[PDB]
Symmetry: none
């Protein structure tokens, strides 16, 4: 139908956690999403943050398609506008101008939130594409 | 039957000013269009500019599917080419490298034209889709 097999529908998009694809760098995660005709997730709303985290394992951290093009100059992989006022950074994040890639992970007794980390650290990931 | 109920036909497209939400940011405006299998209007001619502005309230500003991905690098939401020679900018627009999203609005005694504004500001919107 609107989404490929095992992809999950929310809004105009289809989402997948590539499970078998072993942990990888941010670039290799993006490259794997694009092999499926998808991108790392672009999280524009509370609804999208809530939906995407709804399909993740609380014991794992996941690359999202947000990266720092300069000095806290955050850009989505699809180049759609970054709005600092509709973000989900954990308390104390972002933390370091040396951390240029973004992960989403669960903090005990807090919930899901973004963390800036090294682009070279291997993490799980989640992909999105438009439906049909 | 060439357009869904409440939509308006022009050439090979159907147009709608959404009503269910009364204003929203550029990203949310685009997602709302996409959920109807549409996108923010992509304007490729004088005739399109005139038809789209014809169905608008002169007292309101409306997001269109044009935004700056870099430094004055304008892109359409449907990836069709941007052509500087066929644009409808108001005098003195685009005004600033801080305004990455595009609205159409009516200037008293001048007429309709495009204006670059902050992507986070809430505006009305116009959606477009291929006819049936
Ligand atoms: Ca950090
Ligand atoms: Ca402007």
């Amino acid at each position: 139908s609107m989404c490929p097999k095992d992809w999950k529908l929310f809004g105009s998009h289809c989402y997948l956690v590539p499970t078998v694809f072993s942990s990888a760098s941010w670039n290799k995660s993006e490259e794997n999403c694009s092999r499926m005709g998808a991108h790392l997730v672009v999280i524009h709303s509370q609804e999208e943050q809530d939906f995407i985290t709804g399909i993740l394992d609380i014991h794992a951290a996941y690359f999202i398609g947000l990266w720092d093009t300069g000095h806290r100059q955050w850009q989505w992989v699809d180049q759609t506008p970054y709005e600092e006022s509709v973000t989900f950074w954990h308390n104390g994040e972002p933390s370091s101008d040396n951390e240029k890639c973004v992960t989403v992970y669960y903090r005990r007794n807090i919930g899901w939130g973004w963390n800036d980390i090294s682009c070279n650290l291997k993490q799980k990931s989640v992909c999105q594409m438009k439906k049909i």
